[model samples]
Target: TIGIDKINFYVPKYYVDMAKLAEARQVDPNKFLIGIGQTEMAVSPVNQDIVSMGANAAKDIITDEDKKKIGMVIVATESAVDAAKAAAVQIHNLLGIQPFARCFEMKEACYAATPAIQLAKDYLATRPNEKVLVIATDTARYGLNSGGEPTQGAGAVAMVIAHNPSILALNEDAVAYTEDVYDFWRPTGHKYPLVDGALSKDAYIRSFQQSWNEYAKRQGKSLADFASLCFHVPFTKMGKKALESIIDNADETTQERLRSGYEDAVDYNRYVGNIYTGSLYLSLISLLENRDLQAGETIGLFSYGSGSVVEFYSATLVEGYKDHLDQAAHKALLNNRTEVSVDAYETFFKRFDDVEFDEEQDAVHEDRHIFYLSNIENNVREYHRPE
Candidate 1:
């Protein structure tokens, strides 16, 4: 019965049109629009760091009852602000969750959130009345004009897991695959990640095939039985490539349904780009909100992290699940963002660096009524919650 009770996400208010970016980079417009399957990309401000965004994603979903019942808060991220400390504790304070709850961070590339959610479920099984808050917050920063820049995005997805969930119920059957490789990684003190683009793509596809095949064999369930399959979409086309690889194993009906469902799953991500640790869960939120999923139907999820670890699992939708969703609000969140020019995006991208801090220079005044970075004092990053 322990599963996600509620879910929400947050992205920076500024975005850049992918076509404009393509023009600047001198690549064919369709390269990003159709090749990567991205339309727009979320642009992060100096203030909208992981802590602020993580807190913002969870704020609207937590009720007064949830505040009391939440027994653990976990922030999963590769876009970490601190090397030694955890962002979860600061977010736990920002949300005012019960002080006694355990709070920490998990890091394993984008696969961190999967383990957090699964462990949260195991932890909740011991305390049936309690709940767990898991937030996947990340900034996929690949430096301006870099090869990975187009995949850059900033956002967070937060979920509340509890007993007798109003949304999808977590199934116990799951499988994981791990292999040592340097497909994509940010070593200590590196400002941006080092990526072998071709190798990374191969690793992702290979991991998905390995995990999915093993999962199907272990559970005795084929793709035909799944209503939809969600993958870790670093780019919108990435998931499609993985899905198409094994889609032939399923019936025509299942393959067609899954292909269409995959579009719905990546609809939100098409705008936000890649959010590292938050990418997979954000795609799940998009699927749940945008698709007309019925109760008792199943959804298969594939979580892949660049280091690389991959997991395959399934969930069954709870009855009356539609009543628990906030689709309209989510739509408004994406639609209300203001479009920034390519020049502005570049300036914003260059303004912040590892050793830079200026209270007045870095202030995010244009956007208000959301959590933001206020300033840094004596080496500590300070944030402001909406009044």
Candidate 2:
């Protein structure tokens, strides 16, 4: 089966509570906590841009053997760094994959990675033993103090899908639909994303339902058939809303099963906020670890992006999926974080916009074993390796 064998993720260290952020915007805290369903938003540092975060995430899943065998590296993102160059090129270099591999980037907001994984599956069909690394990296930014401000985030999710995956088995039964809308967009020369909050939400749900309906018809399966359902978590509650639409007719037992799995799915996103390209896969990792899923149980994955595209696919759990998961490591990453006050958050936010630096010392102790940005001198970012 062409499917995800391993998945891993990474986010920056700083964060601010939703209540504190609401107070700054002069809005009711519930608007953020209840309306958006996010309790904390991940904050980014100048050094922790999409490229570095994406690289770090891949490092978590790739070993020396896999690195050498990878035939292609695809980076799916909307939060791009250079207009002319693909970030996948840099990521491929950073990971030290074989020189003959193809590296490219895709865009379509959150739907990018879905295509990447699917395409990689077809490509690997020819090169059976070769692997493909698909990375969803993004920096979701709304203007400061705006409606989407609470959803701003930066990070990456990397999945290594190979010949015989040790985790989830891919189901090639997939469907996609696209709609042109101004729900969300960021024009060229603009540094932040723009959105019509009401329009975006409506568009997101519309595309999801349209595509999911077609998907159900094609598969001849309904929500009750899947053991776990993971939706793209733009925010914590967004998935729950979309999930509810599908299982309305299911019996209470089926509803309860999927609902329980849904909670397990959104566990990681509770803290990460809107990571754009990486959001959905992050939810998958969250679900895989927290859900009490048995081998061969099916999972329905829904991918959505505003301005706009949607896709539905399925995957089966590998026999020893739990053994391959690094639940403890992920838990530790969440537990160990640096908290920032309102004023400090503001300063950090401002500093990241037009960051300039020399060969500066960075205290990246937490990321000792993990790769990270140590300094930048002469426009070259100095990366730190494990000592």
Clashing pairs in 2: none
Task: Estimate, for each residue in 181-246, the C-alpha lDDT of model 2 and write its tens digit.
Answer: 998888898888778877966788888788889999988988778887887868877677777876
lDDT of 1 at 364: 55
TM-score of each: 0.97, 0.95
lDDT per residue, candidate 1, 102-161, as tens digits?
Answer: 999999999999999999999988797899999999999899889898888999999999
Off by over 4 Å in 1: 354-368
TM-score of 2: 0.95
lDDT, candidate 2, equals: 0.83
The stretch of ten residues in a row with the least summed lDDT in candidate 2 is 356-365
Stretches > 4 Å off in candidate 2? 358-368, 374-382
